[PDB]
Design a protein around this ligand. Structure first.
Ligand code: 494
Lengths: 405, 538
């Protein structure tokens, strides 16, 4: 009920960012929604004296036909002062990723109760675009706390603590984490008891996505086990081991490469020498061990790389420094995405970002195996998430692709 | 006197750390002086300006050309920051359309009273024997940074209630003009126009062109639109800037006119920034401009948009990285046309370019009509399927159908996913000496076939490509090739059908003639047999 003063970082003016073209239906949805929010005082129309703009579009969440308003706050978020509080930079609940189940809830409706600092409001300005530039776009600004901004959860942290105080003292074994407009709740309970507890908590929120991180673990580097090896098999194996020797210290390919001596047809079977078998075995033992000196640096950017494996399969690696892997995974999940590559990629990026939020409490910077123009054209169509990560584009095909399959 | 409805001013500030502009006043002729006094007198009578005095340190210069010219340049620098033209093909067909230009646009809108003091200017008196006459603006000045924005927002605010009360008409607001379409009867239409301008008159905005309208380089007729006549200068001696103008005009012409080619004329502009020069045209360029004149020989028109019909885009491959497109609703009647040129790069293929063109058309269409058009593409469904399924990058095209209108986009070669049985295995290698640029490229095979070719003026990458090329030349219709080159593998796995490197082009030509090709990679210097760095290191 009382606004807390907020400024930007030193030497930084508010965001001026071009609004990208929107389809007619999305424009309609945004018009209706923004009119409703205007009548509720959540937003107010502004004049030409506000130079600032932040992009806006419309999405459809899971199991809902209702259009939701999505602001892209990335520029404002990086131009917003780094938020430290009396909480002293609350440490990420590392117990959350170790939980048997984690449920994600959208608490954004709560942010519309708290008013935004009057001076800072001008930086929240956005534009509803018109088709074919036939009329000037409709401009607004947020009176209350906008969803998607990084200052909103920080400001709402005290209130949210005051709200969740009974629940945490009731059943302390339930870990609660908060990121953006999303509230993550860990539990060891049973899915029925889990869902009933979730309804209990959401109604608890009312009067004031099911994830399974236990099923998500880390995966190792495995090598084929064959009775007979061709020249091609051994060539691939040698390549993969030579690559893995960047990750692991003691990988040695010489006795295996020794088998490739002479010029043989690719499909010809080469029997393994005893030394080569021993070498392969030692390599397996080496690959079974974890990686040497791999730590997470909170002061560094997380980097996510994604490879397309075909047939709806995708692989990914989250790391800070090259060949030190904090996380690796394979998204094979098929929902409605069979004929669309970009939709699959978008869902994958969302999942990886989510798991990143759970594990490290922050989103990584993606390197996407897609041309900029394609992605930039289609990504907002398949995007159901309330946040957005940072991304770049790799236009040279990686050789490491089949080394991750 | 019926009071005209008050227009609330827009609060204006200067940039932080700056105080209102102080600049002297240039000497003017007696003529100009008397003229400026004459103008400012009646301007003050109308309430557009007010007389001020020494209490105002701020001054901006003024000339006369009579027409009073006020120079706000320094105030423009000192003023704060304030917050695309409608495409005719997007405009919907309407039974009646009325244009209204507001008279005295900026002067009908009051300036923020606290900002008026900074708008001060001084008329120099005769022979500089008296203090120059002092004035300030009470309204939006001509040439001010914040005039168009404030005026536009004011106009929007005033217009809003009338629009909701008249949903059966449609109003477009551009800058200083209003364009009102309706499907009503001409009588009712004219009536609502009069009602509109009366509604505007309540706030003190004065309104008075008939079709065809000449607007923003366009000719808008009732049932159709086109551009305004394009003037292509005929010169036996051209320049750089002239090619800039030419390419600009051609680009402008290519929206309605199909088949416009700007590439050959554009290639001359690399290494530019010199205003004057004389450059010759290749027969390709000469015939390009000539064919452009042939296309511009007879007029073409676009139609307007009907939301009740599908939006369709069709694409043709024009050759040499050029693509052309038509956006239409019913056959032979185009909403508009356009073109796409390939991006700058070393290697390329048709499918990628087609994809890019599709993205461009999609974005443009979303701007203009607010929707993605259904595509007709010169590519088979199977080709696209094979391509996107086996492509390492993620890629997508919106809903589309095959149209058979050669040249068809096709896949020229496909590498195998597995080694081929019965096919000869060529282990290839190449290497070069950095200092002497002397190198070797060759192969050895499992049947004992070998070759090593010496080469002058070459690099490691070139010999690495050369080796593979040799393997392709000397092998049957089905071949397994083993290489340690990550460069060559990187180029071939990108699947170009064309390259700016002739060696790569020749490799492609070899791949096209092949039935099955399997390209395998191994690490270099691992003691892997058959891969001979020693043959080419000699
Ligand atoms: N100068 C100037 C005008 C410029 C001008 C600029 C714009 Cl952005 C729109 C405009 O006219 C229109 C205004 C409103 C609607 Cl709903 C359709 C229009 O259709 C345009 C199509 N059209 C055009 C002319 C005509 O007679 N009949 C007709 O249906 C006119």
């Amino acid at each position: 009920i009382e606004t807390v003063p907020v400024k930007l970082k030193p030497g930084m003016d508010g965001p001026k960012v071009k609004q990208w073209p929107l389809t007619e239906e999305k424009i309609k949805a945004l018009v209706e929604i923004c009119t409703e929010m205007e009548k509720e005082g959540k937003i107010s129309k502004i004049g030409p004296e506000n130079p600032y703009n932040t992009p806006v579009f419309a999405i459809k969440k899971k199991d809902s036909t209702k259009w939701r308003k999505l602001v892209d706050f990335r520029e404002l978020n990086k131009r917003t002062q780094d938020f430290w509080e009396v909480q002293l930079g609350i440490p990420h609940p590392a117990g959350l990723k170790k939980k048997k189940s984690v449920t994600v809830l959208d608490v954004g409706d709560a942010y519309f109760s708290v008013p935004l600092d009057e001076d800072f409001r001008k930086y929240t300005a956005f534009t509803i675009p018109s088709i074919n530039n036939e009329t000037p776009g409709i401009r607004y600004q947020y009176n209350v706390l906008p969803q998607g901004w990084k200052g909103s959860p920080a400001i709402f942290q005290s209130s949210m603590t005051k709200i969740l105080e009974p629940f945490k003292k009731q059943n302390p074994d339930i870990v609660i984490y908060q990121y953006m407009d999303d509230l993550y709740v860990g539990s060891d309970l049973e899915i029925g008891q889990h869902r009933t507890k979730i309804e209990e908590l959401r109604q608890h929120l009312l009067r004031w996505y099911e994830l399974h991180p236990d099923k998500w673990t880390v995966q190792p580097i495995v090598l084929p086990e064959k009775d007979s090896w061709t020249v091609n098999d051994i060539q691939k194996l040698v390549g993969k081991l030579n690559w893995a020797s960047q990750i692991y210290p003691g990988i040695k390919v010489r006795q295996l490469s020794k088998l490739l001596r002479g010029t043989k047809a690719l499909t010809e079977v080469i029997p393994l020498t005893e030394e080569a078998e021993l070498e392969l075995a030692e390599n397996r033992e080496i690959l079974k061990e974890p990686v040497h000196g791999v730590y997470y640096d909170p002061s560094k950017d997380l980097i996510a790389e994604i490879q397309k494996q075909g047939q709806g399969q995708w692989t990914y690696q989250i790391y800070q420094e090259p060949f030190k892997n904090l996380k690796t995974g394979k998204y094979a999940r098929m929902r409605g995405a069979h004929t669309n590559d970009v939709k699959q990629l978008t869902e994958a990026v969302q999942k990886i970002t989510t798991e990143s939020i759970v594990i490290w409490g922050k989103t990584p910077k993606f390197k996407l195996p897609i041309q900029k123009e394609t992605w930039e054209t289609w990504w907002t169509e398949y995007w159901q998430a309330t946040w957005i990560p940072e991304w770049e584009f790799v236009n040279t095909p990686p050789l490491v692709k089949l080394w991750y399959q | 006197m019926v009071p005209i409805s008050p227009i609330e001013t827009v609060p204006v500030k200067l940039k932080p750390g700056m105080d209102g502009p102080k600049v002297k006043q240039w000497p003017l002729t007696e003529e100009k002086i008397k003229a400026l006094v004459e103008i400012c007198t009646e301007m003050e009578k109308e309430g557009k300006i007010s007389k001020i005095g020494p209490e105002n340190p701020y001054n901006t210069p003024v000339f006369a050309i009579w027409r009073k010219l006020v120079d706000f340049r320094e105030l423009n620098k000192r003023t704060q920051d304030f917050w695309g033209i409608p495409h005719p093909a997007g405009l919907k067909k309407k039974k009646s359309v009325t244009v209204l230009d507001v008279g005295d646009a900026y002067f009908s809108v009051p300036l923020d009273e606290d900002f008026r003091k900074y708008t001060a200017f001084t008329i120099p008196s005769i022979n500089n024997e008296t203090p120059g006459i002092r004035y300030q603006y009470n309204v939006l000045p001509q040439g001010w940074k914040g005039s168009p924005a404030i005026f536009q927002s004011s106009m929007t605010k005033i217009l809003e209630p009338f629009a909701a009360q008249n949903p059966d008409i449609v109003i477009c607001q551009y800058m200083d003009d209003l364009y009102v379409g309706s499907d009503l009867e001409i009588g009712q239409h004219r009536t609502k126009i009069e009602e509109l301008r009366q509604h505007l008159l309540r706030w003190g905005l004065t309104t008075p062109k008939e079709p065809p309208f000449l607007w923003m380089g366009y000719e808008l007729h009732p049932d159709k639109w086109t551009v305004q006549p394009i003037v292509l200068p005929e010169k036996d001696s051209w320049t750089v800037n002239d090619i800039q103008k030419l390419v600009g005009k051609l680009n402008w012409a290519s929206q309605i006119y199909p088949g416009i080619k700007v590439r050959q004329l554009s290639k001359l502009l690399r290494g530019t920034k010199a205003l004057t020069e004389v450059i010759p045209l290749t027969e390709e360029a000469e015939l390009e401009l000539a064919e452009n004149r042939e296309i511009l020989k007879e007029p073409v028109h676009g139609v307007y948009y009907d939301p009740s019909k599908d939006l369709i885009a069709e694409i043709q491959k024009q050759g040499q990285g050029q693509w052309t497109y038509q956006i239409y609703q019913e056959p032979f009647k185009n909403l508009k046309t356009g073109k796409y040129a390939r991006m700058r790069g070393a290697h390329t293929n048709d499918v990628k370019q087609l994809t890019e063109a599709v993205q461009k058309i999609t974005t443009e269409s979303i701007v203009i009509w607010g929707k993605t058009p259904k595509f007709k593409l010169p590519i088979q469904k199977e080709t696209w399927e094979t391509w996107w399924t086996e492509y390492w990058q993620a890629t997508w095209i919106p809903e589309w159908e095959f149209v058979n209108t050669p040249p068809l986009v096709k896949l020229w070669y496909q590498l195998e996913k597995e080694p081929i049985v019965g096919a000869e295995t060529f282990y290839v290698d190449g290497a070069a000496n950095r200092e002497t640029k002397l190198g070797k490229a060759g192969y050895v095979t499992n049947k004992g076939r070998q070759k090593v070719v010496p080469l002058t003026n070459t690099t490691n990458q070139k010999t690495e490509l050369q080796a593979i090329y040799l393997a392709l030349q000397d092998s049957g219709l089905e071949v397994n090739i083993v290489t340690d080159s990550q460069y060559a593998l990187g180029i071939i796995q990108a699947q170009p059908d064309k390259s700016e490197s002739e060696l790569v082009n020749q490799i492609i030509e070899q791949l096209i003639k092949k039935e099955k090709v399997y390209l395998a990679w191994v690490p270099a210097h691992k003691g892997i047999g058959g891969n001979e760095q020693v043959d080419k290191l000699v």
